[PDB]
């Protein structure tokens, strides 16, 4: 059933999510977590290669025809190990963990009506032995901008998301939005790589593209409005100005000179110097006596 048939952009202020489930309002809160660095280089695919997961992944897509359906997460991505398959279908989202034997080039086989806004499934060509986890819920679903954050902590695969309309042709929006918790999956698997799954028709696809960035352990200053919504954030590592704001715990800095940090030259290499003695110690003569 298997078929054997990048550019870079700038993530201005995207990739910020609510770090926990605590309600806060009218407050500036400092938090440390895995966030997408501001003004970073995000890989742009138009393409369904296997990418590294690293510490965490920021995944965004822009499409009109719902071509991107899901993702595969794991290591070897074959029958040898457990892997996570997240796929949206006609009515629901199916999340499974099994020893799946994936196709060399996995996808959903879908055909379209005469009306280009309607489709029906023909087949499934993605791969399911020794299943340990199964979950079903509602679908994860002007162009549609869908942003996801994927984290894997202590066996939990945490998904954050945001779905908004976009009026741009081929890029990410220059503005701020916070992503909300979607689901927390108690899976307990090892994820090092992942792949994006598309719905193709007899195979080609319509116009769609997606962006992949990576999260880093950084400190952010988050601004909560009166409704408990994050409206702004500062990446404290971005520049000396941001560092000052994070130090003062304010989004405004007055004229003057401020001490913000201490610089330190780091060690270039490590050296070890022990004696030029070679003989081994006579412990054997004590214990084997």
């Amino acid at each position, epitope marked *: 059933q298997c078929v054997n048939l990048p550019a870079y952009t700038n993530s201005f202020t995207r990739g910020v999510y609510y770090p926990d489930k605590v309600f806060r309002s009218s407050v500036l809160h400092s938090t440390q977590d895995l966030f997408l660095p501001f003004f970073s280089n995000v890989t742009w695919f138009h393409d369904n290669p296997v990418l590294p997961f690293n510490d965490g992944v920021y995944f965004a897509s822009i499409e009109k025809s719902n071509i991107i359906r899901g993702w595969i997460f794991g290591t070897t991505l074959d029958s040898k190990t457990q892997s996570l398959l997240i796929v949206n279908n006609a*009515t*629901n989202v199916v999340i499974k963990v099994c020893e799946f034997q994936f196709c060399n080039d996995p996808f959903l086989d879908v055909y379209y009506h*005469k*009306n280009n*806004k*309607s*489709w*029906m*499934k023909s087949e499934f060509r993605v791969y399911a032995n020794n299943c340990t986890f199964e979950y079903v819920s509602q679908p994860f679903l002007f162009k549609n901008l869908r942003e996801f954050v994927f984290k894997n902590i202590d066996g939990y695969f945490k998904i954050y998301s945001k779905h908004t309309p976009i009026n741009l042709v081929r890029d990410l929006p220059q503005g701020f939005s916070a992503l909300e918790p979607l689901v927390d999956l108690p899976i307990g698997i090892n994820i090092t790589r992942f792949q994006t799954l598309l719905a193709l028709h007899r195979w080609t696809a319509g116009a769609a593209a997606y962006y992949v960035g990576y999260l880093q352990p950084r400190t952010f200053l988050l601004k909560y409005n009166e409704n408990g919504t994050i409206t702004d954030a500062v990446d404290c590592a971005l520049d000396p100005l941001s560092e000052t704001k994070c130090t003062l715990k304010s989004f405004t800095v007055e004229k003057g000179i401020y001490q913000t940090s201490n610089f330190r030259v780091q060690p270039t290499e490590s050296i070890v110097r022990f004696p030029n003695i070679t003989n081994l110690c006579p412990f054997g003569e004590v214990f084997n006596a």
Partner: antibody, heavy 125, light 105 residues
């Protein structure tokens, strides 16, 4: 396999309301992509579509008959029920229920693959 | 309901090809389907989505849909193919069946 069985009154009087039940097996009414339609065929006449219900409780009715047709589904018994009110002698026909193939995205009816055996209903005094 | 017109009957000799037409207003935009009904029996789907057969349907049955006209063709028509043939088309959720074509052999 997939099968559907019609049951209900085979005789009603004029101005009375008829209730027909379609008992189905091989699939559930709660399953995504599932739909069940009702069609009638008067003696010696062509088939006329009445209504169909989707797994998501969305419903379609024939504009000319809509005012007299109500369709609901029993999510526990896997049954589809069609209510037709204010029947006249001219409404005599054989009634069938059948499975509906459904397009996704913009949801639309496609074709009826599996049909039941049907039940004959007469309207008379 | 959606307007759909069929010929009242078709008559062929055994071994010949039968052709049953179906005319509508928007058959060039939507999909057509065909059902074969024998006397005393429920109709069986023969063609769906213009030219696709359900499993179990003989290769004798084919069809097409162009210029707002749909057709069903039976190649090598057998005496067992005698039936009332009906066409159906959906106009954006609006159902309709043709009057039915009586095919004899």
């Amino acid at each position: 396999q997939i099968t559907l069985k019609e049951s209900g009154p085979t005789l009603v009087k004029p101005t009375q309301t008829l209730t027909l039940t379609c008992k189905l097996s091989g699939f559930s009414v709660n399953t995504g992509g599932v739909g069940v339609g009702w069609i009638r065929q008067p003696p010696g006449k062509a088939l006329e579509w009445l209504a169909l219900i989707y797994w998501n409780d969305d419903k379609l009715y024939s504009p000319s008959l809509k005012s007299r047709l109500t369709v609901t589904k029993d999510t526990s018994k896997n049954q589809v029920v069609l209510t037709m009110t204010n029947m006249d002698p001219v409404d005599t026909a054989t009634y069938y229920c059948a499975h509906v193939l459904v397009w996704f995205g913009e949801v639309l009816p496609d074709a009826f693959d599996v049909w039941g055996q049907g039940t004959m209903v007469t309207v008379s005094s | 309901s959606y307007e759909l017109t069929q010929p009242p009957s078709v008559s062929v000799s055994p071994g010949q090809t039968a052709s049953i037409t179906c005319s509508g207003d928007k058959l060039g935009e939507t999909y057509a389907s065909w059902y074969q009904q024998k006397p005393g029996q429920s109709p069986i789907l023969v063609i769906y989505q213009d030219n696709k057969r359900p499993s179990g349907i003989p290769e004798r049955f084919s069809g097409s849909n162009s210029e707002n006209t749909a057709t069903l063709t039976i190649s090598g028509t057998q005496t067992m193919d005698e039936a009332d043939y009906y066409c159906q088309a959906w106009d954006k959720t609006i159902a309709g069946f043709g009057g039915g074509t009586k095919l004899t052999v």
